[model samples]
Target: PLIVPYNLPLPGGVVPRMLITILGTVKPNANRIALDFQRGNDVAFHFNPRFNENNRRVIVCNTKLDNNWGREERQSVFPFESGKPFKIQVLVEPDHFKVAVNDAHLLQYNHRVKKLNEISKLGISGDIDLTSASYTMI
Candidate 1:
């Protein structure tokens, strides 16, 4: 999870760049958790990132472009079938922000640049199932 402020206007659409792993001790596939929101606001329940074909599990949040209002709130929950191990990359670009799971699926949210500056904080919490849950910025 990362929050970024673009010196210039951010790309209006989507942009993804693979980031080499830093300090996370967990394996590619394992139990994981995260939540993103503004300051002075409580975070929603931790959304599980566990992936299995048998168990339906997927979560998404899409927000509006005009007013930065949450659009398709909690848009979905379903099974994501993929044998290859993958991780979620949550990004806040200049124009739009998103969360991508396993590099295959994505969840979108709005940005109200008028009121917000600098991502207040990124909350990351995972169970003991993995080796590491924290990352060191490069």
Candidate 2:
């Protein structure tokens, strides 16, 4: 009942201090949703919110390349609710990506890919309905 995956092309790609915002609603029976920063066939960052999976209250973060997944960093605190709207904002810093959910700082993931500009694509997918997404240069 929603778009499969919403893709956004970064104008100059991701530079330090760039901010990306996403607004969406989780499905009632949601399993999970993923926000990805991509470069070619590789994923620089995979920010995934998993609900009703292994754990219903956790967020998994990792990177992927050539069908291989890196070590996952799991946070047990989940702020998302099924059948509820949510907001996710990601800021590109010099050494890491800082994430905020619903106006509160959530977590930070260090640059595993190094080249921020290589992440020219943003992909959002899963059991959620995307309302709007935007990019701001800072």
Candidate 3:
């Protein structure tokens, strides 16, 4: 799973008309799994899923600025299973980001750090086996 903490650079950064796609499999015994888009020392987006929550699971989405997290946007709806292969996409829009899992729409997060082009890194933590991660212009 690379500990699945693969930190990669986004060539050309995040530009208009480009969408990021990740192909991977979730760990069978996964508990807490997460990923991030970072702009230097700041987090552009935090996508985390908790499996042990009382009412099923919750996706805690947020941003980190100056090492501090902003108000979290938590949603109970989830599209991932403990043991499954999946296709996830991040569609970048002028005003927000659209996310999808297994080609099904999942969530949209507005741009907290407006200068989207500064988003240069993609960080994925363990519990998932990543096949490949890349972005294509559409």
Best by lDDT: 2
Quote the positional error of residue 111 for candidate 3 in Å.
Answer: 0.1
Better of 2 and 3 by TM-score: 2
How would you encode candidate 2's per-residue C-alpha lDDT over 1-138 as one tens digit per residue? 336598888875799989999999998989989999998889999999898665456899999989799999998779999999999999999999999999999999999998787899999999899998889987
Sorted on TM-score, highest at the top, how do the candidates line up?
2, 3, 1
Stretches of model 1 off by over 4 angstroms after superposition: 1-32, 38-72, 77-85, 112-114, 126-138
Number of the candidate with higher lDDT, 1 or 2? 2
For candidate 1, the lDDT comes to 0.37
Where does candidate 3 stray beyond 4 Å? 1-3
Number of clashing residue pairs, candidate 3: 2
Q: After superposition, how far is residue 77 of candidate 2 from its true place, in Å?
A: 1.1
C-alpha TM-score for every candidate:
0.43, 0.94, 0.93
Residue-level lDDT tens digits of model 3 in 24-115: 89889888777899999999999998887785788999999999999999987788898899888999888888899898899999999988
Shift in Å, residue 101, candidate 1:
1.4
Order candidates by lDDT, high to low: 2, 3, 1
As for TM-score, the candidate ahead, 1 or 3, is 3
Give the local distance difference test score of model 2. 0.90
Instruction: Give the higher-lDDT candidate: 1 or 3.
Output: 3
Q: Superposing all C-alpha atoms, what RMSD in Å does each candidate have to the true structure?
A: 9.2, 1.5, 1.5
